[PDB]
């Protein structure tokens, strides 16, 4: 019953978990139990999704986020992202759910029954936050694990069925990636890319060879780094740059997670490669483009020459130029001209949209896809009324892309706030004034007036 009230610990109940900072056994318990919760929700949610799943409805009309993830990995789906076997979904769910019990068991055991601290029990599993060597060694272990995970994705792509490739010839299909991009110029080229329009930084990855190769580099880098940190201890400059404490390490991780959350938000909002539109619905840019395309097709069938039709502003009604000359769709969608997608690319030539291909080569499947995407634009109300804010009730729809992007923006934001909170606190605690100013030693009083 050590350290479980305010008097002994110094912490109120509302900061109760701060009581765990130097109780490594119990902290191990809290962590394992929490991981337990993560895997639980994964399994349970997957099963829930599966029970509510109708294969003939697009996934994105069904409030699904986990099944799309599984499908993208190549399981259960076939050409065009049609579902051919729901059983892998079932397996992934069930296995996660069973595992959560093991994790919960370990978590609860270390949390209440097991050794409260580990340092006396095991020099190996025991640690002092201020032991830089130990901290970097644990860090090393975990880097090695992450590396193996990345390699697992690579293994799925190259040796175990492949991945779903929205860009595969003849509509989407699962494809084995035989030649992953290993050219470092490409890989790290993505990293040095601008985050602005038409560049899109790493969010711009648009083929699976690049994704796979990138994960090879990541896996190798991680394992190598893990060995590096296991074998070493932080250098002097590093030692002088950082705060070395539990709360400090937490704060660093918090900033990390925030950054990753914002990236995820943009990935799911813009990328249609690792988030295929077949599964997640069209992107916003995609649906806007799709509307332009839809009306170009309709109006052309009625006899319009779309290439020369002048709109009210004097810009082309259907087609105009981008600021660098490329032929693009007109109307407000002029902003979305950087969009690339498998249904549109056949109409593209060297100078952008090709008027001859527009006149002669538009297939019924493209018209269909444009109509579908245009009518599944990621617009919708909080109670899941699809469409613009002024639309009436009828369509129960909010896009997966919206759900994911919004959730992860909220989370990333609060995680940045958490970073500020804990980093500032860690600084103040390490210097010794996190509980307030010492009256007998108030620094400002020992400072000259500003005026």
């Amino acid at each position: 019953a050590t350290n479980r009230d305010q008097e002994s610990s110094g912490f109120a109940w509302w900061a109760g978990n701060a009581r765990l900072i130097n109780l490594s056994g119990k902290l191990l318990g809290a962590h394992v139990a929490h991981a337990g919760l993560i895997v639980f929700w994964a399994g349970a949610m997957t099963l829930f999704e599966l029970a509510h799943f109708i294969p003939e409805k697009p996934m994105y009309e069904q409030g699904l986020i986990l099944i799309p993830h599984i499908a993208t990995l190549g399981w259960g789906v076939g050409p065009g992202g049609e579902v051919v076997d729901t059983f892998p979904f079932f397996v992934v769910g069930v296995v996660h759910l069973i595992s959560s019990a093991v994790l919960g068991f370990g978590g609860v055991y270390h949390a209440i029954r097991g050794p409260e601290t580990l340092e006396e029990y095991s020099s190996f599993f025991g640690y002092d936050w201020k032991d830089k060597n130990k901290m970097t060694t644990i860090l090393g272990f975990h880097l090695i694990v992450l590396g193996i995970g990345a390699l697992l994705l690579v293994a799925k792509a190259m040796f175990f069925g492949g991945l779903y490739d929205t860009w595969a010839p003849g509509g989407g299909d699962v494809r084995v990636i035989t030649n992953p991009t290993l050219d470092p110029r490409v890989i790290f080229g993505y990293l040095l890319k601008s985050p602005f329009g038409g560049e899109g930084w790493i969010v711009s990855v648009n083929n699976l060879e690049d994704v796979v190769g990138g994960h090879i580099w990541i896996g190798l880098i991680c394992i190598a780094g893990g060995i590096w940190h296991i074998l070493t201890t932080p250098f002097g400059w590093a030692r002088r740059a950082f705060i070395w404490s539990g709360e400090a390490y937490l704060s660093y991780s918090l900033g990390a997670l925030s950054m990753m959350g914002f990236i995820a938000t943009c990935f799911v909002w813009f990328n249609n490669t690792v988030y295929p539109s077949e599964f997640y619905g069209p992107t916003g840019p995609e649906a806007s483009q799709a509307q332009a395309m839809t009306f170009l097709i309709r109006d052309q069938k009625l006899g319009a020459n779309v290439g020369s039709a002048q709109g009210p502003t004097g810009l082309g009604k259907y087609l105009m130029r981008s600021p660098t000359g490329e032929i693009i769709f007109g109307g407000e969608t002029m902003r979305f001209w950087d969009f690339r997608g498998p249904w549109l690319e056949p109409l593209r030539g060297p100078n952008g949209l090709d008027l001859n291909k527009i006149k002669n080569d538009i297939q019924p499947w493209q018209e269909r896809r444009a109509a579908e995407y245009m009518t599944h634009a990621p617009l919708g109300s909080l109670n899941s009324v699809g469409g613009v804010a002024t639309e009436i009730n009828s369509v129960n729809f909010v896009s997966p892309r919206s759900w994911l992007a919004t959730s992860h923006f909220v989370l990333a934001f609060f995680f940045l706030v958490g970073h500020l909170w804990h980093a500032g606190r860690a600084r103040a605690a390490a210097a010794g004034f996190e509980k307030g100013i010492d009256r007998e030693s108030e620094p400002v009083l020992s400072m000259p007036s500003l005026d």
């Binding site: 038409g198 009210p312 502003t313 902003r335 919708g380 109670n383 909220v410 500032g424 000259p448 500003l450």
Partner: protein, 334 residues
Amino acid sequence: ANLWERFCNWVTSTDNRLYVGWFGVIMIPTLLAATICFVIAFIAAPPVDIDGIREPVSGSLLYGNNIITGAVVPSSNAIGLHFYPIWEAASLDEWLYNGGPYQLIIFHFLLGASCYMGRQWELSYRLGMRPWICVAYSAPLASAFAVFLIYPIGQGSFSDGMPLGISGTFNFMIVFQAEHNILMHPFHQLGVAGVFGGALFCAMHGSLVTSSLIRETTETESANYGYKFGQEEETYNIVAAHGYFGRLIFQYASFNNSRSLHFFLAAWPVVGVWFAALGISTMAFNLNGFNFNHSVIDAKGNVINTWADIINRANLGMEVMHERNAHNFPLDLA
């Protein structure tokens, strides 16, 4: 001491009339750039083609604006989220026509203001203070990020960022209401609770403290002279304040701990404004307010209007009129 060390000591010096610091090293040049461009633009910038349809909007004073109608106009819809620095333009004339000043201003400002937050943390650490003032400032900062950066990213264009001007702000708000029904969004509602509440508690705290000032002055002098800067003793009786406000409501609704009181005063508007900011940021990805349009239906199936439907009519007026020449196709998808 070497030159680098000397410089580092001056930068982090607690003796400078205004603290510089490392965040200040980024903050100063960036805010200066934003401010100078803003002022020059507000006065003298020629009209800008905000919506990319070759229909330039006049924002500056010299071109027919007053203080209320003037603005630095958002960059062209043809630019979208593309990066448009001066050196990406063929001439300053192009750059101006296309709304380049807006980009220069907001990127410099957001950078600078982030470093402002940082600088708040930094000076608190030099002075041996507790570190969380910057966390309070993270709420107005996140809000600025919402309307100048996040919302454009979601909508695909800086042309939909908030314009830098008074009537421009109003425009942004009205169109926002049309497209997202923000009034019906619970985050905006919490925002309103945050600021209405913050105002209430501001007045409340102020009036209670003021009404419990210990008499230290005569009637011919300002009561303010009864407090002396640096004095060790408190200047008001928190027990009298407590006794009064306790009786106004009931005892257990009033604070008697000044620290809890002040924490509450900090927490309410900050949390509220955080929600307000998250609203704009999540409506940036088109997860909009509640839609109860035609939610009430009679036995036969007639639509029975509620206040939500009236709201919808007003929203429709906004939608159909906004950017009257920019849409060729029937749905306004961004």
